[PDB]
């Protein structure tokens, strides 16, 4: 089970450390709004990202077969386009997704349409949430 | 502790609320010299254009511009009009009509959130920095209006006034004046009472009239300038809230104390520098127009009665 | 013996309620109503009406002040709605059920659907910037038939317990059920409150109808 | 002789039941329903139905007052549901079975998955802060075909046994089967109740199938 | 699940490539985010109508509303040239004719998700 | 077979001693919460941590393989991110995971991917629940 993000194949085991260093990257080097100000991403939008992701996760765990149905792929690409919209709204969310490469992970899970890749991707987003709340 | 009332809204000026609908120049609207504007119901019209000259009527409805309010129901054979929902009187002095808030049954009503937001703007005259985590308005419970009749509506046309009453191409079906609207409002008396509401409402209205409205009324009073004369000092009883039928920036913002001219110049800089052309203080107000003669009434001003239980 | 409290919940306002696992669209309603998955009927949860009734009774039976855990209430609440203190666990006499819609035939006889969408925003007081939202409420005039079960486990407190149940109903007539109720939605009223027994004949069953039908 | 009690458990309400033995994501459904591990389609454990039916008959047959241990029920309850008293022990006449979700074809015909997620919360009374939970209930209307074996030891006692079993099924039709039952989940209903013989032919299978199919 | 070559699992990619073909090769002042938003506020009402609807086959009233959506988008297309540029460049009216040629529920859901993806990538750029 | 806790390695002979020592580090100087008072971790949260490691312990003991599977290590790193989530929720859990160095032990079993390391960590956690209930509990 593999998930190539930018240069890093993240497999089923190192998702936590990579989400941890991705969150620790935004800290001690945060986003500048171009106005000069003091900004970083909220928790409501990032947990909106998670509850976008988890609307598919708790229906995937009904399924035993490792081949995802095409409506689940429709919903996963729909997550991708809603993430595209919310990143289009504010540059903070866009910079978050560009830094913690959610777009690369969602392209990888749309590329390899299997159950294990989506469960690993959901674990990666969930650990991104966990280390954002921890830090 | 749990003081329930009955807030009765009597519209002195026109009251318009929400809708989420922007009825176009041709979309279900017909006004002529009989001065009614029937709104045709939505899907029945196109399912009735299903059964006669379908592509022809679609092509006619897209390529009969610049005229479809009366032109294509008179020179085509659509002269019969049984597809109406209700009639409504109009006010001239051209299109894109807005819509009053209706339920799924189509009866107009005022949502309780609008009155609660209006009362929130009234209470926040004092303590302008009343923060994100307020505790007063978790107890101030407002409810929905009665579903008022379809004969308290009349379509108005808004007008703005600096040196001449300039027509604007915006139509909104507002409420008739002297329309009785029944609510119910409850709160706990540890945080707010009805006397607190009354002095807060009076404070908000007097701060709106003084130092921005009357100071801009003593200027630019012309032959179109001067029902609508003062309406404040006759009876302070029966106080006034504004329900947001395009009342303006000054009604929605609230940083009053103690800004007299700092408020005016900051409002002018904020509104003008980011949006449109830059002029002097003050900018403008917004009355309405209805002929024969235009009466010039201010939008949103109403009357308030509270009776227990 | 076991008693069934069957009535009808007519809505006088919207009552948006619940959350769903369904996606929204970009310009559309966010936070739709909680619905049954099979019938696609809008629904009142038993948990929602139980929690709102328990909050309304517990605030009222303790004279207005209610700043304690639900295991710190009076015992004439705790034998209705249950308790889970470590030692004196009280089994609830009331068993609520999920309340589905009941008069969709009436609403499609009146040629409307079962729900609306309600457009809303907030206003900022600095720049007058708006933030629109849409909330999906059930329309007013839609009924909600329910069957609350009552464990008739003591005969000496059933009369005052059904007086408490009627008071919880009537306090819920004065207060919203769920969702954005402080902004003018969720006002509910009760119709045709009645009691029947499960199996058998309860002797003191007409005067329980005299308490509810009052 | 061996008889097989078979029927169907349809759900009128949610019926969350059981616990896993499975990890849960962060913003996601805590406490998933028990599922049959191979197909991982939702399950009614036979233990839960036995426990609730035994509770209901041992409570009702007593007089309505039950505080004793399972080994201090009536001789009828110890005859059917088994006992473990130290001297004069009884074999359980009824053998319950794990009950799988049966009508998945009818639930996929409606294009809905077999389990939903019910969004609930509690509100603090003191600080007015909330605390959401998501629980996994089965969807209502989802039938549960079951079968229970009845160990027929004496002919002169089977009719009273089946009358008491039907009494337990009618009592179970007025309560919940598992999970958060007082908040509007768990309500079941028994239909298609029939009794067949496992091997051979019972002398009076007509009067037993009359009782359950009344 | 046709919807004019737009598969159920690639509507976002189709909208993304279409709008990269929009903002490259533009017309002379640009397109405002208001008229595409009006297109969305026209489609979303019947989206709200269909999203809770039980049966697979759509009713007459739904297709009638969809037809008046065609009439309306033809009205702003005839009124403004950037609008008809959007309707021919992003294959919108072909998708609407595809919706009234299938008249299935998933066809209109896929079409709604496509115009949703159009406005999403318009906000993204 | 060792497991670096801070820098003091625990083996299968001296882990329960350090679990009891860590409980008496947490007890007798409990967590002041910036409100003023001192709080200790409830039994339900700590038994949630115990069942969190026992969802893997139920699948580890029934295998003979001294090298851990890739699915088991996935759930061990998932345990780590979940413990890091609960530590970010309330600081009373954070002080517990800090003083009983749960994250450092779970990193050590995450590095040396062997069955004996997880068994030693599971007995360490189980002994830690044990001394939580015994020393200074409500029972």
Short mmCIF file of C-alpha atoms in Angstrom, two decimals, chain D residues 10-174:
data_model
loop_
_atom_site.label_atom_id
_atom_site.label_comp_id
_atom_site.label_asym_id
_atom_site.label_seq_id
_atom_site.Cartn_x
_atom_site.Cartn_y
_atom_site.Cartn_z
CA UNK D 10 -38.09 -5.66 11.31
CA UNK D 11 -36.81 -2.41 12.76
CA UNK D 12 -39.20 0.49 13.20
CA UNK D 13 -36.42 2.66 14.67
CA UNK D 14 -32.60 2.71 14.42
CA UNK D 15 -31.28 -0.09 16.69
CA UNK D 16 -27.67 0.68 17.29
CA UNK D 17 -26.30 -2.38 19.07
CA UNK D 18 -23.02 -3.84 20.17
CA UNK D 19 -19.41 -2.77 20.16
CA UNK D 20 -16.24 -3.24 18.16
CA UNK D 21 -13.08 -4.19 18.22
CA UNK D 22 -12.32 -1.64 15.51
CA UNK D 23 -10.44 1.65 15.36
CA UNK D 24 -12.40 4.87 14.89
CA UNK D 25 -11.31 7.96 13.00
CA UNK D 26 -11.25 11.35 14.70
CA UNK D 27 -14.25 13.13 13.29
CA UNK D 28 -16.24 10.00 12.55
CA UNK D 29 -18.54 7.37 13.95
CA UNK D 30 -17.61 6.28 17.45
CA UNK D 31 -19.10 2.97 18.68
CA UNK D 32 -19.82 1.12 15.42
CA UNK D 33 -22.48 -1.57 15.29
CA UNK D 34 -21.50 -5.24 15.51
CA UNK D 35 -21.24 -6.92 12.12
CA UNK D 36 -20.72 -10.53 11.07
CA UNK D 37 -16.97 -10.42 10.57
CA UNK D 38 -16.82 -12.24 7.22
CA UNK D 39 -19.46 -10.33 5.29
CA UNK D 40 -19.31 -7.38 7.74
CA UNK D 41 -23.07 -6.80 7.27
CA UNK D 42 -24.75 -5.78 10.56
CA UNK D 43 -25.74 -8.36 13.15
CA UNK D 44 -28.17 -8.91 15.99
CA UNK D 45 -26.27 -11.03 18.52
CA UNK D 46 -28.29 -13.90 19.91
CA UNK D 47 -27.01 -13.04 23.38
CA UNK D 48 -28.53 -9.55 23.33
CA UNK D 49 -31.95 -10.79 22.25
CA UNK D 50 -31.80 -13.60 24.81
CA UNK D 51 -30.86 -11.15 27.55
CA UNK D 52 -33.60 -8.66 26.76
CA UNK D 53 -36.30 -11.31 26.25
CA UNK D 54 -35.24 -13.06 29.47
CA UNK D 55 -35.31 -9.73 31.31
CA UNK D 56 -38.80 -9.02 30.00
CA UNK D 57 -40.35 -12.41 30.80
CA UNK D 58 -38.63 -12.70 34.17
CA UNK D 59 -39.80 -9.18 35.03
CA UNK D 60 -43.35 -9.68 33.78
CA UNK D 61 -43.98 -13.24 35.01
CA UNK D 62 -42.79 -12.29 38.51
CA UNK D 63 -45.39 -9.58 38.98
CA UNK D 64 -43.59 -6.68 37.43
CA UNK D 65 -41.01 -6.51 40.23
CA UNK D 66 -37.57 -7.88 39.39
CA UNK D 67 -34.45 -7.40 41.49
CA UNK D 68 -33.15 -10.96 41.67
CA UNK D 69 -30.25 -12.60 39.95
CA UNK D 70 -30.79 -14.67 36.75
CA UNK D 71 -30.72 -17.87 38.82
CA UNK D 72 -33.59 -16.66 41.04
CA UNK D 73 -36.23 -16.25 38.33
CA UNK D 74 -39.35 -18.38 38.03
CA UNK D 75 -39.25 -22.09 37.27
CA UNK D 76 -40.60 -21.29 33.81
CA UNK D 77 -37.82 -18.79 33.04
CA UNK D 78 -35.20 -21.23 34.29
CA UNK D 79 -36.89 -23.94 32.22
CA UNK D 80 -36.54 -22.00 28.97
CA UNK D 81 -33.59 -19.66 29.27
CA UNK D 82 -31.41 -22.00 31.31
CA UNK D 83 -29.98 -21.72 34.79
CA UNK D 84 -26.81 -22.53 36.67
CA UNK D 85 -28.02 -23.27 40.18
CA UNK D 86 -25.72 -25.58 42.07
CA UNK D 87 -28.01 -28.54 42.75
CA UNK D 88 -31.09 -28.94 40.54
CA UNK D 89 -29.87 -27.40 37.29
CA UNK D 90 -31.85 -26.87 34.08
CA UNK D 91 -30.85 -27.12 30.44
CA UNK D 92 -31.94 -24.19 28.31
CA UNK D 93 -34.79 -25.27 26.06
CA UNK D 94 -34.28 -22.37 23.66
CA UNK D 95 -31.03 -22.13 21.73
CA UNK D 96 -30.68 -18.64 20.30
CA UNK D 97 -28.62 -17.83 17.21
CA UNK D 98 -26.77 -14.83 15.84
CA UNK D 99 -29.11 -12.95 13.54
CA UNK D 100 -27.83 -11.41 10.32
CA UNK D 101 -29.29 -8.58 8.30
CA UNK D 102 -31.47 -10.39 5.80
CA UNK D 103 -33.17 -8.09 3.28
CA UNK D 104 -30.09 -6.35 1.85
CA UNK D 105 -31.59 -6.71 -1.64
CA UNK D 106 -34.56 -4.58 -0.61
CA UNK D 107 -32.32 -1.98 1.04
CA UNK D 108 -30.03 -1.79 -1.99
CA UNK D 109 -33.11 -1.47 -4.19
CA UNK D 110 -33.69 1.84 -2.39
CA UNK D 111 -29.98 2.66 -3.00
CA UNK D 112 -29.13 3.24 0.67
CA UNK D 113 -26.37 1.55 2.66
CA UNK D 114 -27.39 -0.67 5.56
CA UNK D 115 -26.13 1.55 8.40
CA UNK D 116 -26.54 5.28 8.92
CA UNK D 117 -24.75 7.70 11.23
CA UNK D 118 -26.89 9.50 13.79
CA UNK D 119 -25.44 12.85 14.85
CA UNK D 120 -26.14 13.49 18.52
CA UNK D 121 -24.78 15.86 21.15
CA UNK D 122 -25.06 16.81 24.78
CA UNK D 123 -25.28 20.38 26.05
CA UNK D 124 -23.64 21.37 29.31
CA UNK D 125 -26.10 23.08 31.62
CA UNK D 126 -23.46 25.10 33.50
CA UNK D 127 -21.33 26.46 30.64
CA UNK D 128 -23.66 25.98 27.59
CA UNK D 129 -20.89 24.20 25.64
CA UNK D 130 -21.71 21.22 23.43
CA UNK D 131 -20.18 17.78 22.86
CA UNK D 132 -21.14 15.95 19.67
CA UNK D 133 -21.19 12.21 19.16
CA UNK D 134 -21.81 10.12 16.08
CA UNK D 135 -23.30 6.66 16.55
CA UNK D 136 -23.89 3.97 13.94
CA UNK D 137 -27.45 2.73 13.86
CA UNK D 138 -28.95 0.27 11.43
CA UNK D 139 -31.58 1.81 9.21
CA UNK D 140 -35.26 1.38 9.98
CA UNK D 141 -37.28 -1.13 8.00
CA UNK D 142 -34.31 -3.49 7.71
CA UNK D 143 -35.57 -7.00 8.47
CA UNK D 144 -33.65 -9.63 10.44
CA UNK D 145 -34.55 -13.22 9.61
CA UNK D 146 -33.96 -15.41 12.65
CA UNK D 147 -34.46 -18.97 13.83
CA UNK D 148 -34.44 -20.40 17.37
CA UNK D 149 -34.34 -24.09 18.26
CA UNK D 150 -36.70 -25.33 20.97
CA UNK D 151 -35.61 -28.44 22.88
CA UNK D 152 -38.86 -30.37 23.35
CA UNK D 153 -38.49 -32.43 26.52
CA UNK D 154 -42.10 -32.98 27.67
CA UNK D 155 -45.35 -32.84 25.70
CA UNK D 156 -47.47 -31.74 28.68
CA UNK D 157 -45.69 -28.39 29.05
CA UNK D 158 -44.92 -27.15 25.52
CA UNK D 159 -48.13 -25.12 25.04
CA UNK D 160 -47.49 -23.00 28.13
CA UNK D 161 -43.87 -22.61 27.00
CA UNK D 162 -44.92 -21.28 23.62
CA UNK D 163 -47.55 -19.02 25.18
CA UNK D 164 -44.79 -17.57 27.35
CA UNK D 165 -42.47 -17.24 24.32
CA UNK D 166 -45.20 -15.33 22.46
CA UNK D 167 -45.65 -13.21 25.59
CA UNK D 168 -41.93 -12.44 25.50
CA UNK D 169 -42.12 -11.52 21.83
CA UNK D 170 -45.09 -9.23 22.50
CA UNK D 171 -43.22 -7.65 25.42
CA UNK D 172 -40.16 -7.24 23.22
CA UNK D 173 -42.32 -5.53 20.60
CA UNK D 174 -42.96 -2.73 23.13
#
